[PDB]
Subunit: 93 residues, 4 copies
């Protein structure tokens, strides 16, 4: 609850930083910058967007190392502390 | 057993929702929509398909956050509660 | 030791099946088929190769669900039961 | 602390080896080689770079199996032993 709340905020700030960085340095539209940040940090990585500048490539290296751990923590506690009880609620006779 | 069964169903419904969404909004053939949903939620992400619309990009962001946890849970219990015993069965003299 | 050995074999057989499938149905060279199988099951997924046939797409869906759990188990026990001691060996004065 | 330090070094050496390999055999610029090594071992895998030679494909197979476990260990202890306390520090009244 309080755990999920902090992880939510931390993940939001991370995605805001990526949105700002890639829309400025890589010239993406803000929605595309957000989408790319998510596709990156979840490791999906389609490659429909990818950094073309060296600044973008260096940021991306650092962004991945700092952000993957946080994003997957959130995905994990979301599944565990929000998704897991709710599915059991739908179960019990 | 009962665990694996619930995870199977939950994963199926998730993949059905993606199949329906991407065949409608992104105009994919249903098989391609299913395939893309799987390639997305397992994080493989080839990028042979990727959303071209903003609606598609926003759904994909949400779809990834909600679905990755469920899919990998299923992959995990499938390996643990179905794959792991079966391989030991083939072992014991 | 015996754990790592079984996981090695199981991973090899999985990669052999992918090598055979993608070289036949998708017409890849055997080395490219192996490479693609690995890039797929580790979720790296560059997309330099991806299935173009519906048979290939359906197999890939199943191949991912069955194979990811096994591959990452191997990667895990390789790191834990082979990589982790060896690095400590290089450490102790 | 001492754990994080060893994982840092091990990850650095891994990324140096990839930087050297892909700039030589695949002809990438060193920054692109580093970037590609990171995008590979974190499994993001955009595919903006991917190996074109058989030597490159075989190395990549081995590089992924050896390196993913190490990289994610580092990402994990970085989040746990460096990121997790620091965020709590910002919390306590
Ligand atoms: Ba990927
Ligand atoms: Ba890709
Ligand atoms: Ba791609
Ligand atoms: Na991944």
């Amino acid at each position: 609850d309080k755990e999920f709340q902090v992880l939510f905020v931390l993940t939001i700030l991370t995605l805001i930083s990526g949105t700002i960085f890639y829309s400025t340095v890589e010239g993406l539209r803000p929605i595309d910058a957000l989408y790319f940040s998510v596709v990156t940090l979840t490791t999906v990585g389609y490659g429909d967007f990818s950094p073309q500048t060296d600044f973008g490539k260096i940021f991306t290296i650092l962004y991945i190392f700092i952000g993957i751990g946080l994003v997957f923590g959130f995905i994990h506690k979301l599944a565990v502390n929000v998704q897991l009880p709710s599915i059991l609620s739908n179960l019990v006779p």
